[PDB]
Amino acid sequence: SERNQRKVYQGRVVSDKMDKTITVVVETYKKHTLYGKRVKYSKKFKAHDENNQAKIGDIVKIMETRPLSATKRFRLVEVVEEAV
Amino acid sequence: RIDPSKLELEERLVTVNRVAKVVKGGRRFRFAALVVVGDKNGHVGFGTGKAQEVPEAIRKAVEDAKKNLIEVPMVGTTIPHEIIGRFGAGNILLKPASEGTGVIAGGPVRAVLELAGVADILSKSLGSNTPINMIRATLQGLSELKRAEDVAKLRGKSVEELLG
């Protein structure tokens, strides 16, 4: 009787200046519907950091929920890997 | 090899070009000719036709036609596979199809394929619209055809293994 699993990703962090929140870049990449070659985009979101344990260039997962503020529609799961 | 003249050639013409030459006095109008020549059983050829008249050019087309013939494989009244000939700026590709599909080809090219006996060809004149080179676009591709039992003999392999 488990409820439906939500949207989820992992990615990479640009900046940390937002209060208890960050941006995370998702790098999934696809082909074009006319030619065939597979180029990469930039997909970035706004993610909740309840512990403020974020780094510039941090590998981390995000998890959506009800929208916490303006454009913020994610929370973290696990800080996967850190920067240097 | 050279195809012998011990056949039944049908030899209907394609076009006539009046072709000039400029001398001290004025022009000199002659005629040009080219006639696709063959049976309806797989032997196609042609020659040029040059004269100072209409009908003697029709005669001398048949000479180099009987000097130069070439043979086409007739697997199921089709071409056995797909090929694209590329002789001299006139590209004409050749596609096989099923047996009901008829002869869909260009103007001079349609007077070639019926002079093979092969009645199932899709084609499309990619290159220029010139009558000599479009016929050169056909036979050069038809020269590069292959037979099913022949390439299995080339590979040293079974013929049915080329199908299954």
Binding site: - | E99, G100, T101, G102, V103, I104, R110
Partner: protein, 195 residues
């Protein structure tokens, strides 16, 4: 039309006679006895198409779609289109012999009433399948068009079972193109309407 002036353009007795070529094989007109010229493929494939469509008088709005209705048919598309215009009900009336011309067979469908497995059919262009019976009710039981053409006892085609007074018409598996068209060259009309 005249239905005979158009066949001398084709230069053939399209119903199959000894007439309409004697004394005048040149096609129509004052440019008739002035000797004709040799045409192109477009010159041929018109007349090669028109040697079949002037058999049945089919307007080319109705001639195009039956070619397309042969497109969905299996088998060779040339011989498929031979089947549909010899399964034409106008041709079935003429091949049962009660019409001297196929144009005479048109009134034999239109108001010379006739019964296909039931009430009546006023359709000169009904596609006829094997397994159908054809008769005429007593309202036009024996008129002199039928009475003379019963007496004109022509040969019955071998895909038909026909009696004179019983007047019933049924079929075989198909009308076969070897039996159907001696004059008309096939496989040219297909390459006409592929372009």
């Amino acid at each position: 039309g005249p239905s005979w002036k158009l066949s001398r353009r084709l230069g053939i007795s399209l119903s199959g006679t000894g007439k309409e070529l004697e004394k005048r094989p040149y096609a129509p007109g004052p440019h008739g006895p002035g000797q004709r010229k040799k045409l192109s493929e477009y010159g041929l494939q018109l007349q090669e198409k028109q040697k079949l469509r002037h058999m049945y008088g089919v307007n080319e709005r109705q001639f195009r779609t039956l070619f397309d209705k042969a497109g969905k048919l299996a088998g060779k598309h040339g011989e498929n289109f031979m089947i549909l215009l010899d399964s034409r009900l106008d041709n079935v009336v003429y091949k049962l012999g009660l019409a001297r011309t196929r144009r005479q067979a048109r009134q034999l469908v239109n108001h010379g009433h006739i019964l296909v497995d039931g009430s009546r059919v006023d359709i000169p262009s009904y596609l006829v399948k094997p397994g159908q019976t054809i008769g005429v009710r007593e309202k036009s039981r024996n008129l002199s068009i039928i009475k003379e053409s019963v007496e004109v006892n022509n040969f019955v085609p071998e895909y038909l079972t026909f009696d004179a007074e019983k007047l019933e018409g049924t079929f075989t598996r198909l009308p076969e193109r070897s039996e159907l068209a001696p004059e008309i060259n096939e496989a040219l009309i297909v390459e006409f309407y592929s372009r």
